[PDB]
A paper describes a structure:
The pro-oncogenic cellular activities of estrogen receptor alpha (ERα) drive breast cancer pathogenesis. Ligand-dependent transcriptional activities depend on the association of coactivator proteins with ERα to form functional complexes. SERMs and SERDs elicit a structural rearrangement of the ERα LBD to sterically preclude binding of coactivators in the activating function-2 cleft. Activating somatic mutations near ERα helix 12, Y537S and D538G, enable hormone therapy resistance in metastatic ER +breast cancers.
We also solved structures with the WT LBD for those molecules with no existing structures (LA-Deg, LA-Stab, RU39411) or were able to solve to improved resolution (RAL). LA-5 possesses a 2 S methylpyrrolidine and showed a SERM-like profile with an IC50 of 15.68+0.27 nM and a normalized fluorescence of 1.706 ± 0.09 at 5 μM. LA3-2 and LA5-2 are subsequently referred to as LA-Deg and LA-Stab for Laso degrader and stabilizer respectively. We discovered that addition of a 3R-methyl group on Laso’s pyrrolidine induced both ERα SUMOylation and degrading activities, while addition of a 2S-methyl on the pyrrolidine leads to an accumulation of ERα in the breast cancer cells. LA-Deg induces SUMOylation but to a lesser maximum than fulvestrant and GDC0927 in WT and is further reduced in Y537S, while LA-Stab did not induce SUMOylation with either receptor. Despite their unique influences on WT ERα cellular stability, the methylated Laso derivatives showed identical transcriptional antagonistic efficacies in the WT and mutant cell lines compared to unmodified Laso in our assay. Overall, these structures present canonical ERα LBD homodimers with 2–4 monomers in the asymmetric unit.
Numbering used by the authors:
A (entry chain B): 307 to 336, 341 to 418, 421 to 550
B (entry chain A): 307 to 337, 341 to 461, 465 to 545
Write the structure that this text describes.
Amino acid sequence: ALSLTADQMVSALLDAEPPILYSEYDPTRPSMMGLLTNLADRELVHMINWAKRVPGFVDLTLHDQVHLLESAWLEILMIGLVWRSMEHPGKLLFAPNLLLDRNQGKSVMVEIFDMLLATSSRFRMMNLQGEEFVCLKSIILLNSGVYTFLSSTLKSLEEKDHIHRVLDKITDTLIHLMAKAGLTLQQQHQRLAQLLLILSHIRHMSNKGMEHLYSMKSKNVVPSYDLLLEMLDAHRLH
Amino acid sequence: ALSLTADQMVSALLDAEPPILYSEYDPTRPFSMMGLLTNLADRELVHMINWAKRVPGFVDLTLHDQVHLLESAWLEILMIGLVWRSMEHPGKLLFAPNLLLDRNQGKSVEGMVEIFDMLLATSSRFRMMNLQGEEFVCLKSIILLNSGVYTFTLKSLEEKDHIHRVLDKITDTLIHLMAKAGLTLQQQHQRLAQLLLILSHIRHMSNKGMEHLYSMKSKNVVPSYDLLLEMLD
Ligand SMILES: C[C@@H]1CCCN1CCOc1ccc([C@@H]2c3ccc(O)cc3CC[C@@H]2c2ccccc2)cc1
Ligand SMILES: C[C@@H]1CCCN1CCOc1ccc([C@@H]2c3ccc(O)cc3CC[C@@H]2c2ccccc2)cc1
């Protein structure tokens, strides 16, 4: 678990990658938020499966797993989107059959389209690599909720220590990747820093986004603890 | 500014540090929490502008871009300051030397104890990491340069490039500090990452806080571009 080598970490993360889903609409017919919501809902099921395959995540309590996903899920959809969109300047590839520019975001939203587009830009600028992307996405999963375990039972302390050890392992892994690519030591820590500072912006976008979903006043429109629990709380019967 | 050594960067940042202000209230009268905190934050902001102008590379930017960066960062910068001076007061927030509050005192306005709890947890994280003063001023400068840089023409391309060069320099500086402290190369990279990942939480806290002040519907409870412009210009 914490015994994995760097290439073992990378391979594990790459293997765990969720699928790219399609928007569900009649391509033979002439709804924006509805399309985006349906897509996100289906992605979330796959995100749970992905999380359970991030090395060290299942070692956590069921409760702490839920807490981490409750905190990170929109950031994770967003970094997924920004990655998919990297090779489509000016557009967001929500799905292979749903490629939108900023003008199409005006039907509701263009404020958060603009933020997403700029992140995609920034990724393009840095020439972000696939192996770097999956590290970052796992870092979001582990880090986003780790400061909000309002708890300090012995168990909670052990949980927080474990999470920071897994995070250290991914740091080592990112550095390894950049060493593997020929970067100098200075280039390595500079790029590590550049990559991690983008995570703050992704946090920001998730907050502006959560702000919309909460403004809708829809009873299901933000995944409840209980929904996330139902989805993570698997049996071993299959 | 891009020609500073790591030690010169650290000296510059340490010298740039704003003063610790006091809360303004009559200490002889019986103990408005929001009013006290707002008055304190208002006065800190003026000193923040002076500090920002002293961060190496900041005044090299256009005045427009200076304003944009402060507009994005100002609440994060107040928050990291608070968390830092609270570090050695477990369970409390040292808003000012004469205003040390625990979470119970945060319950006076609705929606405030949640923000208190987050601030306290960050302070705890700082305590656990044994955060050093030199690291703190690096981090605060990083917030200033980074928070607005993804939400901005050839001039703008040049501005963004400059900002990222200054950020790289502060990264170099943090690593140099950890080197001086004798950490291994592995430990250096791990601690760099741990420090930077806390900045995501501080952003989160700023967003929750901005949400409070916007909810107040007070005419100028969020500092305007033009007020920031006036103080910077
Ligand atoms: C999907 C969630 C899970 C349970 C309830 N359901 C609420 C729907 O929340 C969303 C999440 C993301 C989006 C949009 C989106 C969809 C898929 C994806 O891969 C990325 C994103 C990025 C955010 C985007 C969005 C979010 C808020 C407001 C406008 C657009 C829209 C609605
Ligand atoms: C600060 C700005 C300047 C122009 C308008 N004015 C609005 C008042 O804004 C604030 C900012 C921070 C606070 C609280 C604060 C005070 C001093 C400081 O050094 C640290 C902080 C941390 C945030 C805190 C707060 C913020 C929002 C809601 C509750 C508590 C309160 C009001």
